Short mmCIF file of C-alpha atoms in Angstrom, two decimals:
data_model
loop_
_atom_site.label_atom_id
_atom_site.label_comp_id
_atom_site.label_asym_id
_atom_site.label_seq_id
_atom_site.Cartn_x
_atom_site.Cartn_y
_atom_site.Cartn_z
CA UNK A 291 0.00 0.00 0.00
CA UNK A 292 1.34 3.39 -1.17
CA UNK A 293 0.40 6.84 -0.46
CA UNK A 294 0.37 8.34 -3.91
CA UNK A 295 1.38 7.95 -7.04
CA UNK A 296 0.81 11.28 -8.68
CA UNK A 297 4.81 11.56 -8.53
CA UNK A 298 6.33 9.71 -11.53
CA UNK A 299 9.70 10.34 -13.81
CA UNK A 300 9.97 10.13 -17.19
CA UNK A 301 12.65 7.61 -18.42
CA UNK A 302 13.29 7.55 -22.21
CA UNK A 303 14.38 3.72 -22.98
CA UNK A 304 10.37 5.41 -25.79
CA UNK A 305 9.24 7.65 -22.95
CA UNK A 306 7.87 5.84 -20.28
CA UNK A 307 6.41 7.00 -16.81
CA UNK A 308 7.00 5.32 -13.71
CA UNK A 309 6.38 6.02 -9.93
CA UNK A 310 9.41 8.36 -8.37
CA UNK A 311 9.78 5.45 -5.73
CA UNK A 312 11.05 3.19 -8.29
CA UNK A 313 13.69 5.28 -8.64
CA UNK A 314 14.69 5.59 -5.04
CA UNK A 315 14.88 2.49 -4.51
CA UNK A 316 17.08 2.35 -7.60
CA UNK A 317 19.48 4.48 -6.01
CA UNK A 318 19.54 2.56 -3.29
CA UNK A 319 19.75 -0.54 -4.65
CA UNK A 320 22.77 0.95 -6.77
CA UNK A 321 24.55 2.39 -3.43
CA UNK A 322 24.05 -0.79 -1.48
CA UNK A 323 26.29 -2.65 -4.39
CA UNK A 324 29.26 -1.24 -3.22
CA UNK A 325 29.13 0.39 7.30
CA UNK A 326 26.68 3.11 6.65
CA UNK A 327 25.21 4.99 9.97
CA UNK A 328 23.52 7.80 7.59
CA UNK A 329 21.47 6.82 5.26
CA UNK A 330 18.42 8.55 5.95
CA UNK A 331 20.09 11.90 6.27
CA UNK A 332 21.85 11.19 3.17
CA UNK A 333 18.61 10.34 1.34
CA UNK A 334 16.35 13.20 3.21
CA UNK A 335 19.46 15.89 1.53
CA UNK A 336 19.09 14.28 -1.86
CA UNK A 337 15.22 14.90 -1.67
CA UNK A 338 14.52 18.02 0.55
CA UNK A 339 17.08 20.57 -2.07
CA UNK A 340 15.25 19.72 -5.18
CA UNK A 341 11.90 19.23 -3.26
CA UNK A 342 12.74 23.22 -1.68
CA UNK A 343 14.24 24.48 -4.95
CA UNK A 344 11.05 23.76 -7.54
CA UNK A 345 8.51 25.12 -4.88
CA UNK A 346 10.62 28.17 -4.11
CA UNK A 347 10.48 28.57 -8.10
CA UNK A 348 7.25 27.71 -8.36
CA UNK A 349 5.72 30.30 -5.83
CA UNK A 350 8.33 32.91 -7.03
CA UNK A 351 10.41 32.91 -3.72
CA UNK A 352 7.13 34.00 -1.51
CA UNK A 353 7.96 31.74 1.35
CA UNK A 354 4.40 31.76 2.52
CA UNK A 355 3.07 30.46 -0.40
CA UNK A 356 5.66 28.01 -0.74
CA UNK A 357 5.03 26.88 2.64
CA UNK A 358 1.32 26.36 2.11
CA UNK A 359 1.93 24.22 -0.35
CA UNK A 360 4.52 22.42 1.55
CA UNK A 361 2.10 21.92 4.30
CA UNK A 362 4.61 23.35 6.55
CA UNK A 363 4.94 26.75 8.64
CA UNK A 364 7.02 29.57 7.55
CA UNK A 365 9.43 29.24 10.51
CA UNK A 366 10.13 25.20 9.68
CA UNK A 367 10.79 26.32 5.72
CA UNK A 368 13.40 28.95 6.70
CA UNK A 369 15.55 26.14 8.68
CA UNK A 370 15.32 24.29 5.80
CA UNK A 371 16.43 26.24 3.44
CA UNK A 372 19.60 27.58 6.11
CA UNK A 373 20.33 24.49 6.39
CA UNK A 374 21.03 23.90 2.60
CA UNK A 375 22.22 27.49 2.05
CA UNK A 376 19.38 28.63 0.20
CA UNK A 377 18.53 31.06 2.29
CA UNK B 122 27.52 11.84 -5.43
CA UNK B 123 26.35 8.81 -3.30
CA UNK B 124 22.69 8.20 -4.82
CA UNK B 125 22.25 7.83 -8.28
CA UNK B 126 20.06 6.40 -11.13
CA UNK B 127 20.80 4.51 -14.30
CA UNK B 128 22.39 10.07 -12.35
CA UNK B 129 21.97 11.44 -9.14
CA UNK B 130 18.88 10.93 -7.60
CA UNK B 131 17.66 14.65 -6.97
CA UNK B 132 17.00 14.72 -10.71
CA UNK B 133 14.43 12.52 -10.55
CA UNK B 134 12.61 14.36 -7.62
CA UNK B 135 13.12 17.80 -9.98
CA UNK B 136 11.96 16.08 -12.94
CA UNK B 137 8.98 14.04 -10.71
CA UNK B 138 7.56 17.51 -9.60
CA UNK B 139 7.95 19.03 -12.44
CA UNK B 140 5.65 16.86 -13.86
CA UNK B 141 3.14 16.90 -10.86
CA UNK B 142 3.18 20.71 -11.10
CA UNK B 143 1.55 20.36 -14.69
CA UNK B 144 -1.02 18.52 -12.89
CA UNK B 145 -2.41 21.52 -10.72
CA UNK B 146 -4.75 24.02 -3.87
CA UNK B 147 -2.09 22.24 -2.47
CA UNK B 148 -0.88 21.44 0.75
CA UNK B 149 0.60 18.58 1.79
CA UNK B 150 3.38 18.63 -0.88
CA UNK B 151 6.25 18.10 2.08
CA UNK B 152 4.70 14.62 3.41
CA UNK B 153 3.47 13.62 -0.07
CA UNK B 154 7.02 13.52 -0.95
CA UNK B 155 8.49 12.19 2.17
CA UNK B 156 6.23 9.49 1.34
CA UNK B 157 7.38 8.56 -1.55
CA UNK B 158 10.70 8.52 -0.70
CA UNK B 159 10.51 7.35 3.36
CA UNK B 160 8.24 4.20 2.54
CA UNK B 161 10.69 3.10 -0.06
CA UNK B 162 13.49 3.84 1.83
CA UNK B 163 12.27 1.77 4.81
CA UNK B 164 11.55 -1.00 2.17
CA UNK B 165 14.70 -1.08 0.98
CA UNK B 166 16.67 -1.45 4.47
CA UNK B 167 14.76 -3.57 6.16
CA UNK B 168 14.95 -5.99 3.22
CA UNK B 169 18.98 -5.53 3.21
CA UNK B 170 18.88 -6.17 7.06
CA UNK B 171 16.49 -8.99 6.65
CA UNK B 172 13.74 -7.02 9.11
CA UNK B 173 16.08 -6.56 11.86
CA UNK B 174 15.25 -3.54 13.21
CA UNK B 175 18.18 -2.50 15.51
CA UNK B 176 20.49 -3.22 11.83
CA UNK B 177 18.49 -1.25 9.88
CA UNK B 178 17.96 1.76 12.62
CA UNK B 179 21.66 1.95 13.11
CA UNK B 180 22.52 2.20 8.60
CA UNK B 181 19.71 4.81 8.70
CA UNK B 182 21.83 6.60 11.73
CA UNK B 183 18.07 6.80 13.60
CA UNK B 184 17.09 5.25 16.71
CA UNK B 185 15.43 2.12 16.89
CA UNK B 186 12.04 4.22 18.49
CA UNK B 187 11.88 6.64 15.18
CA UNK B 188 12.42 3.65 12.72
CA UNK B 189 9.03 1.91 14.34
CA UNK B 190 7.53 4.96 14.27
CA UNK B 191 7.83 5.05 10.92
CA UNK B 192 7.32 1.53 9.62
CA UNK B 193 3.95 1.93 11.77
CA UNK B 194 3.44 5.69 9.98
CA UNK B 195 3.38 3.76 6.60
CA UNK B 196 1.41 0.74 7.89
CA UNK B 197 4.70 -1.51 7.19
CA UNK B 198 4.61 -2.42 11.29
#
């Protein structure tokens, strides 16, 4: 049981869509080939910066609107972004 | 430079709401993606630890507590 699958990439193999979960666990897959104590930091970086950086564009920097959408506050998006040096 | 695809893994997410974005209120984008990502993520460890917990707690550099939490958050418990 999944939450959603409105999230899908496009791979061209021609262009086919499939769910973005696929590709995590790709990546994962991919990084396990080759003693980790953090992964879910390391994932949560890979996915917060791109998640932050299309809704900032998207809402044209307002950082209220960008936190509605996030369905966070204003205070918890501005921590975020330090936190990656977006801010 | 650690998580990548056949590269790196952010792309995807970029290109993944890029294409969700096309679909639009909104405002749960935050979990929905942690979602997609966490549930995945979980699957993936616990299947490399063989669903041993404390293992897969201590790659994720979490506490065993938080990792339950989650599994249970996702109805993997």
């Amino acid at each position: 049981r999944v939450n959603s699958d409105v999230l899908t990439v496009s791979t061209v193999n021609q262009v086919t869509q499939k769910p973005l979960r696929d590709s995590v666990k790709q990546a994962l897959k991919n990084y396990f080939a080759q003693d980790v104590n953090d992964l879910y930091e390391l994932v949560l970086a890979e996915v917060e910066q791109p998640l932050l950086d299309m809704v900032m564009q998207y809402t044209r920097d307002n950082q209220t609107r960008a936190a509605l959408m996030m369905g966070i506050n204003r205070g918890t998006l501005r921590k975020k972004l330090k936190k990656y040096g977006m801010n």
